[PDB]
Design an enzyme around this catalytic site. Sequence first.
Site, mmCIF file in Angstrom:
data_model
loop_
_atom_site.group_PDB
_atom_site.id
_atom_site.type_symbol
_atom_site.label_atom_id
_atom_site.label_comp_id
_atom_site.label_asym_id
_atom_site.label_seq_id
_atom_site.Cartn_x
_atom_site.Cartn_y
_atom_site.Cartn_z
ATOM 1 N N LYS A 45 0.815 -1.215 0.000
ATOM 2 C CA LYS A 45 0.000 0.000 0.000
ATOM 3 C C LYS A 45 0.846 1.262 0.000
ATOM 4 C CE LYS A 45 -4.135 -1.746 0.181
ATOM 5 N NZ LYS A 45 -3.883 -3.071 0.750
ATOM 6 N N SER A 269 -2.467 -13.153 4.010
ATOM 7 C CA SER A 269 -2.829 -12.951 2.603
ATOM 8 C C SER A 269 -1.736 -13.453 1.657
ATOM 9 C CB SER A 269 -3.188 -11.465 2.334
ATOM 10 O OG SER A 269 -2.056 -10.647 2.217
#
Lengths: 320, 320
Positions: A45, A269
Amino acid sequence: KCAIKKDVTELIGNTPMVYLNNIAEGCVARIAAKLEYMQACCSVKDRIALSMIEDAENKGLITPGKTVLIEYTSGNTGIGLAFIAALRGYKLQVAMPSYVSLERRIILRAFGAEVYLTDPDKGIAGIIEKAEELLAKAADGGYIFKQFENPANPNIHYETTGPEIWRDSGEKVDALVAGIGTGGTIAGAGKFLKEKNPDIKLYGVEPSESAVLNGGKPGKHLIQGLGAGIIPAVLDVNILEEVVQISSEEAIETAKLLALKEGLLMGISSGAAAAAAIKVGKRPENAGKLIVVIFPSFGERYLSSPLFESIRQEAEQMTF
Amino acid sequence: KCAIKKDVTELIGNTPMVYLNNIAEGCVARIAAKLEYMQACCSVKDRIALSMIEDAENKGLITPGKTVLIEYTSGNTGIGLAFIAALRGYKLQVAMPSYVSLERRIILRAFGAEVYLTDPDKGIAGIIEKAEELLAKAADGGYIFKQFENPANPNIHYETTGPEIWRDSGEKVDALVAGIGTGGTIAGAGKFLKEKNPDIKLYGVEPSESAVLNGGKPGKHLIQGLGAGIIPAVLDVNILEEVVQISSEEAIETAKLLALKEGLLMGISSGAAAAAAIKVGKRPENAGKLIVVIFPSFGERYLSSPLFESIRQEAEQMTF
Ligand SMILES: [Cl-]
Ligand SMILES: [Cl-]
Ligand code: NA
Ligand code: NA
């Protein structure tokens, strides 16, 4: 002088890839993992935080010391915005569900960001509502980044993530496997890669307990970063070959194997993405191909998560 | 294929440098920080874990599935050994003081390492004694790495850390500032740099509460990674220009400023090193010079430490 970076924003992106070896036993394709923890604040991110801030600056929509920056987040986008807001002199407020780890709230506060927690039962609607409330209270103006619809999110992956994969794979990448949260990574990097080679196949990953891209209903799951329960505006599902469904349990077991077999302490993830890539890599039609899989973050960011629950219990009961 | 790394061990070293800007206001030298968290398991010790394992392998002193690897550690060297031991099939046992964070013990166990805690009142003697006890119990042979005396520790910094600084600074580095734990970093990188340019000055950093290199007595301090209370065998104090003393309080305040002013979430020992580099950089004799400072690790590894104590208290009391 000649290789020294100007500031922390020049430490974003340009992440390395590594082959997966013993964990990929049985695969007939070769698998390489792109390690997004190897950058400024250790997650994918960071790319979109810089891209969204720069886009707003190019439009004069945010001004340091005047505009309040606001984002709804589960942690990593907030942290990416927070280190850049600290560097550049912006006030930052994040809206997050109250289940986000204490650790990530500590990091946000260490960068000076303000944290506003929301009711987990209100889901994504809750954090968007809080961000709107914060915008209404911003006396000198505010700006909500809206990472689920902001084109600067997929665009940065078109401009950097995809080109890095193409170049670093020697132009030999045949497939991209990426978990879908906002969908920006697979949308932007995948768009670029298919322009380079339209035979490249794009595989999304989502939780089997919240398989909304495959037409299932939303549901609770443990794969932090995936499974938003919506189809984000920045994602065009039509470019995908397939969305692989991975259970929370399988994601956790594969993350444990990444540490034990590859020496890679990765998060849940990344475990889900690796599990999907290994399944695709065992298919005979992919014999001899190169599959690139995105690993979004590092496992150290998730030590209070169920990934480490049973270890945590053992270590608490030890003495000298 | 062409830039993809073979495995995690090829993600060690080759770390970037970044200029320090607003935090260095008032300095007449330019300061660049070398970010050792940008590698396989996010600390400088990854370099020496690989170097010490490879040295033992080159001598046939460790064999996968046979030899028990043993090290005394405060955390980072243990973690470096642990991810490589997992990859290569070695059993690993670490001796650590019982005050080491639960978080680092979780990471060690996630890599399959065995953790043996020792009495903090017995200091370094306690962990060396435990490592010797473990070696005596190793039925098929064991090996203690002994990072305070093992030449593979400074040698890897002579072979990689120093050359990286020389090359990446465009051969313009004038000084190296580095905290001293084992002393391997400043001993090895400093030896290399002074061979390239004998005018380069080496500045050690130690806690003012345990200023043993300056002739003080050992004492308790909070600068994790520094202040072992001994002069390690791998360090030759004669090559140093000076050892700068930094208080635990100053180290913590400077670490907080690294996050708030530079966007760099760094640990307490990086705070101490930065504080020393900034002091040296304000001296008129260093006007126009380039100072490189080593940042050994990342702040996320230390969220339970006093660096975050007051933030932790605030975040615990928040609701939606
Ligand atoms: Cl333990
Ligand atoms: Cl909070
Ligand atoms: Na094309
Ligand atoms: Na020389």
